[PDB]
Each structure stands twice: as C-alpha cells, then as structure tokens.
Design a protein around this nucleic acid. Structure first.
Lengths: 262, 143, 206, 177
RNA sequence: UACCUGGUUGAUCCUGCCAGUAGCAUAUGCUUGUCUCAAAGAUUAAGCCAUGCAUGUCUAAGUACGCACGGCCGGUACAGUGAAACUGCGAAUGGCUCAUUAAAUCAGUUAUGGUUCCUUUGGUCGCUCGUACUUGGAUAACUGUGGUAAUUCUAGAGCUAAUACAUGCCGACGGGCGCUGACCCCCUUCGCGGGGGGGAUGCGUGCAUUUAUCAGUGGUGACUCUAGAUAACCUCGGGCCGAUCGCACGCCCGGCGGCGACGACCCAUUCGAACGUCUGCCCUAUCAACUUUCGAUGGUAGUCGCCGUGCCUACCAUGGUGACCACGGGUGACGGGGAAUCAGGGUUCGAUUCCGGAGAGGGAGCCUGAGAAACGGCUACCACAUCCAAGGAAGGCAGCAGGCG
RNA sequence: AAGCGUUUACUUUGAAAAAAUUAGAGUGUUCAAAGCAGGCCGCCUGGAUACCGCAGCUAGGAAUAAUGGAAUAGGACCGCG
C-alpha cells in the first residue's frame, strides 16, 4: 500500500451501520470531510438502507443530480459524503426534515423534525486558536471555524449556530448539573444529566453521568456531548429517549405490542 | 571551569550581551505535580536534553526504575524489575528491561540503589527516550 | 544516495538487524550543500509533501543582528575563520549553522553616526572630505540637541568592541541554515560571547 | 533513426530524453526512456536530408517558387488579428475575422468562422465587476463583523471591570472583618 | 458427557508403549437420484509463460477554422453534437502471494509539545503604498516528405488556441501611524538652561518565511504556544492578491449588480503516513562471553531529512549486554483477531476473503506525481527470454482465465 | 468544591479493548443449515446482549508476601539570636 485507502470492504466497516454480507463484497467508502470515518454516515446508506426510497445504489447517484437533497443549506453532489452528528438532510418540496441523532442503541434513527427546528444547530467547540491578527477562533467537531465569538465559550463547551449566515447565535456552558449523552461506544444512546466532573492529571478526564432513573455511570471527557441546560434539552428526542433498559425488559415490552395487536 | 565544549555554551532563551551599566537563567515546570529542583535554577550549567532547562518536554508515559550503572558522562543505566504471569504454568517469571535514561547534572548526589521516576519524551539518541525527573534517596544509608 | 534509516545498523547489544523492506522514498538522503562564497546562486529541490527547499552553493547575502541594539542589515560575507563543527571547514570556506566568521562593520557604522551621531573608532589624521556624514553630525536644532545629548549619555560602548571596529572587521555567528531555506542569517558576536572565541582562535593557531 | 540536436557525434548513440525536449514524445507523464538517435553531423551514412532554403535563388525552380501554399489556419487570438491586420484597441475585431469557404458535393456552400479568444465581451466584464464586487462585499462583511465583535468586546469589558470592582470591593470587606 | 478394550504368562497384578476409538484437513478407489450453500496451484516450482483482458476519463461551467455531422437568419466570432489533439485528476486504488522477516513484522495503551498532507468541508483571499475594455510569442490536430526489416519509433516546412508557458496592472488608494524631523507656537529663568504642543520632505507599514529583543489578547499539566511591536531578509532553478470559462438577466444617466465551475497564499477537518514508550514470540550451550576506530555505547558541534536522533560527519569517555540466557545459528516462522479437539488445565494449526507489514525473478538507482525507490512505470547488470532483412528493436501472469514443468 | 500522601504484589469497579468468527433474543428461506426479516389495515419494529486474553489509566482496603525510618544520634516538634 503506497498510499491511503480508497475502497471499503462490506464486513470491514464497523458495526453501527448494520451492513449485510450477502449483497456485495465492497462498501461505499466515505470521502474526506468534516466528520469521522467510523462515526459518520454516507448519504447512500441514508437513503438506500434506512429510508427505503431506492433499491440499487445507482438511484442515489441520480437523486443528487436532480437537485433534491440539500445539507445545511449547501447541496452536496457527493453521495459518499461523511455526515456525522447533527446534520440536517432536508428534502426540498415534501418538507420532511431529518436530523442525524444517535438512537438508544448504537445506530441512527429516522427522525422527523419541523422546519422551525431545522433552521439552527447546536455545535460543540473543540479548541481555541488565536488568529494571525489576534482573532479568537472556535473550531467545532465538524470544524466550523467561526471567528469573532463570545469568549465565554470555553474548550469543553457548545455553541448554537445559524445556517443561512454561518454565525453563532447562543451557547450552553459546561456546568456541573447539565444534560449529557455518550457519543460513541457500548453506552452509545445514554441520555442523562451530569452529576460530577472529575479531572485527572495527565491522562483523559472522566465525567460521571447520572440517569433520570438513578443509574449513575462514568464517561470520559472526549466521549461526551451535552444536549441542554439543566434538564431542558435544546434538541428533540427519538422514541426510547435514551434510557437503555435491560434486555430482559425489552422482551416484556415486545410481547406487549404483539398480544395487543394480534 | 565551564563551557569546555566546542561552541559557546548557553541557554537559547537567555541573552546577556545587552549594554550593561549575575547571568539570567530560564527554566520551566514539568507538570503532573513534580517540583522543580533547586540547583537546576541555582547552577550555572546548561543541558539541552534536560526536561527542566532544555528543549525537551515529557509526554506520554511516566514510569520508574532503580539505578545500577553510572560509568557514562551525563546519563545513567537503570533497572526495571517487573513480573509477568504465565497462564499455563500458574507462576511468575523474573524479567527486566534495562535501558539508559539521560541524567542531567542538576542532581549531584546520585548513588546506587536509588529509585528514580522517569518520564517519556522525544528520542534524543538511538535508544534513549527518557530523562530523569526527580531522584529519591536509597533505603537508609545516609552516610 | 545516503539513506536515513535506523534499522540498517546494530541493536543496543551488538546484534545485527535483518531488514524486511527496501529503502523507501521517505528514507531519502541527498548529497550535502557545502556552499562557497561568490555570486548568488540558489538551487531548488523537491521535498516530501510537495514543498520546496532552497540550496545555497555560492552566497554573499546575510542579515546579522547586532545584539545590544537589535538592528540587523543584509551585510556582505567575505571569509570563514573558525567553525565549531570541523577543522576542515575552518580552512575550506563554507557556511553552515554556528560558524564564526569575519565580516565588515560599515553598514552598522552608517547607522551609528546617523541615529546617534557619535564618533566610534575613527583614528585621527583622516577626515571625510565629501562631508556627507558631518552633516549627519552637525546642523542641530534647539530641541533635537536635547535628544542628541540624551543619546550621548546612553551610548557607553564596551571597550572590547571598539578595538574590533578599529580594524573594520567584526565577528558573526551563523544562526540560520543556508542549506534549507537559502539564507545564512545570524547575530553579531558581542561581549562575553565574542570574548570566548578570541581565546579560541589563538588556542588553535598557537 | 532520427538525428539529434547538439549530441556532437557521428555514429549511433542511445540517449535519454524528457518532456520539453524534442525527438521523444512522453507517453507517460515525465517518463525517461533511451532512444537510438544519430549524430548532429551529416555524412554519407544517411538516407534523407532535410533542407531549409532561407535565401531564394536567381533562377526559378518549378517546385517551390512556382506553387505557393495558401495558409491553413489564420490567427485566432484577437491580438494576433491586431498584429496582422494592424488594428487598434477601439476598432471592432468581429468584422475582421478570418473565415473560410466550405463547399462539397451534396451539400450547400457554407462558411465557418473561428471562436475568438480573449475578445472584449460584456460577459467577462460581468465577471470582472463580480470579482471586484466580492472584494467590496468581503470588505464590508468583515468590517461590520468586526464592528459587532467590538461591541461584543465592549459588552464584556464593562462587566469584567465591574466584576473586579466587585472583587476589589470584596477584599476591602475581608480587611475590615 | 471428566468413559475405554486386546497384545508379554502354564495361569494373575502392575509399569509401559503398540494396536484398536472418535473428530479435525488433503489425496486416492468404488458408487451416486434430487436439492440449498460451497472450499478449490501454496505445500515439491515466490518455477516459466504462448494467447486475450484488467485506468482511463468531457460537464452548461478550459481550449471546436476536422461539414464527420449539422441551423440558414448571416457577414456582430463560435446555433448544437462533434472524431482526434492540447490541458487537469487518477493510474501509489484494487486483485495475487507470503519469498523475506524471531522485540524485527505484528497485537493492546499511548504521543508528533518532534512533521507533512491530493481531494472534501469551516474561514482570510481591495489589509501591502508602487495595454489593464485583457499583454507576449511557441506547439499539438490538420496539409505535405518520409526513413525502417522491425516499435504505442521520429523529424524537417505552413500555422493556429490556452485554466499548458512567461509578463504584469486599472480599483482598493486618502491617508492612519513610527523615524530621520527642517522649523513654528507658549510658559519660566537676567540669561544659559528647563518644560509642553503642531509639523514640511522621504523611507517603512498584508499574509508566509529568516535573525534578534521588549512586555505579557487567549489556552494547555508544563512552551522556545498563539498573538503585539521594534530592526532588517523575501531566493529570478520565484508565493497569493482570479490577464479563465459557462448560464439565466436586471438598476441609473458609460457607471453599478447574480448563480456557479475550476485552481489557488495560508490556518483548522478527514483519510492517513512515519517516527516514538510499555508489554507479549518457536527451538538451540554439540552457541559463554558478545559488540567496538569497518558508530558498537553517550556528550559537543555540524550535514541530510518532513522534522528528533551516529541517520551521517570530526573530537572527547570505553564503554553497552549477558547465567532475570546476551551474541550466534536454525525456524516445512508474515503476525494478530482467531479455527479444531476439548470436564478443567491445555495442545495443534493459523499463507487463505478482516486488519497491519513485504513483494511482483534478483538486488542497486530514479523522473513525473501530494502520495512510488512503483514495476499491467522507468535506468543499468545478472539469470531467463521475443522478432530480425544481422542494421537494430522489444518483455516480466507469486493478477483475471488459460498453457508447460 | 481545589490540591498533597513510603513504595509495590493482591483484590473490586469503570472507559477502552475494530468487524465476521465464540455463546446467544427475535424470524416458518415449507423444518433445517444460512440469512437479517416480516405482519396488518402508512405503521410497528429490529438488526441486542455476553467474552475481549497480557501490559497501561482510573478509583475504595492495607489482612497477607517484602522495604526501612532514629542508636558514633548531623533523630523528630514548637520556637529564637
């Protein structure tokens, strides 16, 4: 291998797409972009595997040429766009706006939002760099370098932005007692409140996350996204609402719907 | 006295050639709650490979070891006795990975048997990637 | 050419490694610069990552910082006196980093009788007949005489420097790398740093 | 084997070439390949000699002086039209285009004209006014964006001074406890 | 599922192996109706390959004077396809194999605070003070000469275009500011003297880089971090300030505006890459002392490098390792995740669809290209090997099928 | 609420430990192996979970295996010239 990878095996992709072996050897490799490789979602899986709009992958190639799928105000013509956390894939004429939020499991979920919600995002800043003219720069997780910020936003904070101007609107600070959700791992899909932050010298920092039912658990600082102030989220929640109930209780609610309907 | 090497020996940060009418010294704290020794500030020596008065920073791992050899100039050889469990034969094996760490002359009274904590840094030579952080005294033997 | 690889030699014990791959393009080493003094000539080389480096073969430009007043000029370079690296480079006229060389003083002289207008060196018996710099020393107003009197009391020069200016030649160190960027910048020797190498030139010469 | 320029030999040598030099077409981009070429000197070990007549003779050869080959392609850049037809900056270039008659059996007689490159066009003038408009718009956008940040900076520097004024008020209370 | 029987004796009980016992992979022999999946040249030959094929690609957004087509409304250049050609990106992806390799690859935690980064995304892209209503001249295609036995061989004459190649500005742009600062104004002192303002002329005044200092907007666990200014540097084998193109189309009395593509100076994103730490590897004493001016172990100072380093160079010290098995040798050893048998403890296998490393017969060297020491890319030699008109040209199936051994 | 502890071996918890493969919830491809469905007049849902060896980080304990504090006293503690 005298260069970077360009192809992608179907099985070599990690678990969180639930890709299937019987279809093809290869898989659509996400291109270069603002999001991860194992934490993103190409648009071809978003439409073919999840939404059941198409049957083959060549139909997705036609759709992006028909000026239908717009992403946060910019129409992307690349069907293998790596789209990670909180990107609005917005249908133009039917009006169904979708927001990429993790499900209660490690997967994504189909989630319909109103157009009033789709006008803005919450974004999480990663670092502060002083620009070449003494200009403070905020870099998001999807690398939205927005200059001239409110400096009260700190390293581990979040910013609320508008999309038709590319500027921030408001922010939520990292205070002890805020909401939380684990963005990645075995506890992916755990919506809870922050009960205690602990700083450990040299190594990674850990923050204890407390569930609304009393299930307190620890999460490392790089694996945290805060969703709201106190107990009031600034985003919407899918079904399940990020609880991760035990596997014995899943079957008890599975047979409740079957026997009620028949 | 000092500066017996080939070029001029000074700290790259300091500057004493400005117009006059003691030499200034630059140092740095190391982090992870380790103090800065007194003679690295008080002394007049220089060393570019010291994590206190040189262009090197400790990052990654911090481990420890015990000194066994000092017959080099400005570095020592340490011993690291570690135990490994064998799953098949349920007993332990005595293994060591002895390697050289750069001892700056900021510490003066360094003897045999002293436990010395050591910190990972950038490679400064072929096999050394460590520097002496602080030196603890041996078990007794004050004399 | 030469290869920059750690695995081509022995271990720390004395055993010889067995390489698993051929020398790569990221194991690249090109022949040395070994620059001389003459007309300006920069050769370019393509490096890893699509960037460029500038190799000097004959160079005369050099911007050298006078430490006590922090002013530098692009002054001509003429010769090599001592190098801390090799004694062959002492005799063979080459400039690499940390080279102690002899330079002319005149670009720093012109600034001294212009901003401060004080005689330094300037052995008696010879006067500047074009009268260009006596204008730079005379024709003073009322409130600039106060300023030039302030500069007179704040220009106490070191005794070691004036002897060096009397012969017109100064000592300079090569801080920058002419092999990489094509520039041979540095700073002028001053004070104790200059005093160390005047003992060193006699230690080798005898 | 074709001959070469400057090789200064007389027999048969094999020489590597590169892009930008004649007698070798680069198939791959920048590929080096040796090629059997002949010397720049001419001798009796030749088959075809290529000659260029610079000075015309007194007598008339019926091969080249008699038949004059017409031009195949005329100038296409409008500046070479200005060089050939002695045109200024103000006069039109479109009327001074070099067209060609086109006729064949079975079709009507036609004429074709070249697409003139680098001609003064209000399309590129729309492009020229656009790229200087983005220079205007980016100048105005960052000026007001810095203006709203400066008021935002002026928004904290009064509360932060008052925060320390309340903190310097706090040290005075502990000094009188 | 934590299991056995026969064999030494005239006839017993033990040790003990053998024989039987059952799966796990490979082949062979006989036989075979259906039907759902299906391994499949590696073992010896990482041996050699006849034959054919695997990376080419045009949108409205780079060039169209090929009627090869084609609109007739022409004289205001190109209606629109459009062969071929110039120009960008990819061809460093992928498939095959495990020859090589025993702290080396590889596997788990880590750091680049010690560097790059094609394409994509978020931003600066009138910040610099000194013919622009668009500069210059060269070429492929085409016309024509062919040379040769032979090729993806090549030239002479006529051209023509650039988002190929060089040069370079209108607008910003009138002034903000530091110095040289002539000179002017005011107060006090008998006066020299002291103090406070205004300011002519020019230079400098973007980003990025190089040398040097002063003070210390915003962070890290710690900077020689970022940033501000001072004094200069800006490689002619140069760094940007759109000398590009395409589609609807508008506002004033020639001047103002839109949607883009493309490539760009730089900072962040992504895929990474490489350097680093700790821990983990089969057998061997019929390998006990090994290594070291032919860097082996550290320091000083340099060169190269994407940077840190004996990676390399001159001088200092002769050290560094080993009985806690070093060095050396062999390995039918690429490693791991894992597979089989199993009460448990393990044993054996693991080249084989996933990951990381290596390679295309062998090493050695290399252009272009961000990315190769590439090999369906080159330059030599060695072994092999094709055509030949005897002058020369031309090749790498341990790829897809397929052929020989 | 922020920081410090004479060091380890031990024990317990927590993130991480790349998919398929190990066990395993669901499902009539007619059982079945495999596979990720299907049923109702657009919806309901899933594609879990368990293991992840060794070394390393982290947080409670010092019973057990060691180590020694000070004994020619330059031994601790509050302090002064």
């Amino acid at each position: 291998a005298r260069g970077p990878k360009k192809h992608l095996k179907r099985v070599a992709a990690p678990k969180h797409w639930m890709l299937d072996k019987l279809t093809g050897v290869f898989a659509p490799r996400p291109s270069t972009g603002p999001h991860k490789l194992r934490e993103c979602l190409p648009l071809i899986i978003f439409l073919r595997n999840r939404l059941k709009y198409a049957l083959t992958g060549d139909e997705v190639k036609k759709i992006c040429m028909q000026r239908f799928i717009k992403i946060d105000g910019k129409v992307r013509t690349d069907i293998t766009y790596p789209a990670g956390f909180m990107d609005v894939i917005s249908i133009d004429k039917t009006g169904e706006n979708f927001r990429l939020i993790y499900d209660t499991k490690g997967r994504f979920a189909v989630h319909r939002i109103t157009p009033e919600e789709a006008k803005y995002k919450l974004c999480k800043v990663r670092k502060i760099f002083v620009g070449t003219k003494g200009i403070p720069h905020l870099v998001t997780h999807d690398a939205r370098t927005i200059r001239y910020p409110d400096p009260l936003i700190k390293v581990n904070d979040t910013i609320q932005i508008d999309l038709e101007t590319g500027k921030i609107t408001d922010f939520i600070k990292f205070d002890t007692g805020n909401l939380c959700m684990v963005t990645g791992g075995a506890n992916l899909g755990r919506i809870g409140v922050i009960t205690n932050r602990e700083r450990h010298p040299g190594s990674f920092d850990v923050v204890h996350v407390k569930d609304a039912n009393g299930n307190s658990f620890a999460t490392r600082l790089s694996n945290i996204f805060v969703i709201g102030k106190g107990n009031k989220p600034w985003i919407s929640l899918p079904r399940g609402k990020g609880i991760r109930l035990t596997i014995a209780e899943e079957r008890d609610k599975r047979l409740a719907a079957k026997q009620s309907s028949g | 006295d000092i500066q017996t090497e080939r070029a001029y020996q000074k700290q790259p940060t300091i500057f004493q050639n400005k117009k006059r009418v003691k030499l200034p010294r630059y140092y740095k704290n190391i982090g992870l709650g380790f103090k800065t020794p007194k003679e690295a500030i008080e002394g007049t020596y220089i060393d570019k490979k010291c994590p206190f008065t040189g262009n090197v920073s400790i990052r990654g791992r911090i481990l420890s070891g015990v000194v066994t050899k000092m017959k080099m100039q400005r570095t020592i050889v340490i011993r690291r006795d570690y135990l490994h469990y064998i799953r098949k034969y349920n007993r332990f094996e005595k293994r060591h990975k002895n390697m050289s760490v750069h001892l700056s002359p900021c510490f003066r009274d360094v003897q045999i048997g002293d436990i010395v904590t050591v910190g990972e840094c950038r490679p400064l030579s072929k096999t050394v990637r460590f520097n002496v952080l602080k030196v603890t005294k041996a078990a007794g033997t004050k004399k | 050419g030469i290869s920059r690889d750690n695995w081509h030699k022995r271990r720390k014990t004395g055993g010889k490694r067995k390489p698993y791959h051929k020398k790569r393009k990221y194991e690249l080493g090109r022949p040395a610069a070994n620059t001389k003094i003459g007309p300006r000539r920069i050769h370019t080389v393509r490096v890893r990552g699509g960037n460029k480096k500038y190799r000097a073969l004959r160079l005369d430009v050099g911007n050298f910082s006078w430490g006590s007043e922090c002013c530098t000029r692009k002054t001509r370079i003429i010769d090599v006196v001592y190098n801390a690296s090799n004694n062959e480079l002492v005799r063979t006229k080459t400039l690499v980093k940390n080279c102690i060389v002899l330079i002319d003083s005149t670009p720093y002289r012109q600034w001294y009788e212009s901003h401060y207008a004080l005689p330094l060196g300037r052995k008696k018996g010879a006067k500047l007949t074009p009268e260009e710099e006596e204008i730079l020393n005379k024709k003073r107003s009322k409130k600039i005489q106060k300023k030039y009197d302030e500069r007179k009391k704040n220009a106490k020069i070191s005794s070691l420097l004036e002897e060096q200016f009397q012969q017109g030649k100064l000592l300079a160190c090569i801080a920058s790398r002419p092999g990489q960027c094509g520039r041979a910048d540095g700073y002028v020797l001053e004070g104790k740093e200059l005093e160390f190498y005047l003992r060193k030139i006699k230690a080798r010469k005898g | 084997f074709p001959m070469k320029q400057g090789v200064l030999t007389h027999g048969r040598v094999r020489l590597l070439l590169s892009k930008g030099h004649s007698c070798y077409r680069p198939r791959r981009t920048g590929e080096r390949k040796r090629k059997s070429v002949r010397g720049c000197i001419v001798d009796a070990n030749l088959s075809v000699l290529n000659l260029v007549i610079v000075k015309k003779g007194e007598k008339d050869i019926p091969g080249l002086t008699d038949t004059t080959v017409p031009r195949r392609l005329g100038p296409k850049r409008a500046s070479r039209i200005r060089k050939l037809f002695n045109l200024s900056k103000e006069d039109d270039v479109r009327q001074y285009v070099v067209r060609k008659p086109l006729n064949k059996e079975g079709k009507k007689p036609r004429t074709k004209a070249p697409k003139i490159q680098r001609l003064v066009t209000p399309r590129v003038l729309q492009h020229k006014r656009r790229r200087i408009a983005l220079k205007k718009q980016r100048t105005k956008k960052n000026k007001e964006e810095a203006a709203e940040y400066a008021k935002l900076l002026a928004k904290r520097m009064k509360e932060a001074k008052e925060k320390r004024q309340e903190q310097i008020a706090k040290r005075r209370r502990l000094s009188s406890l």
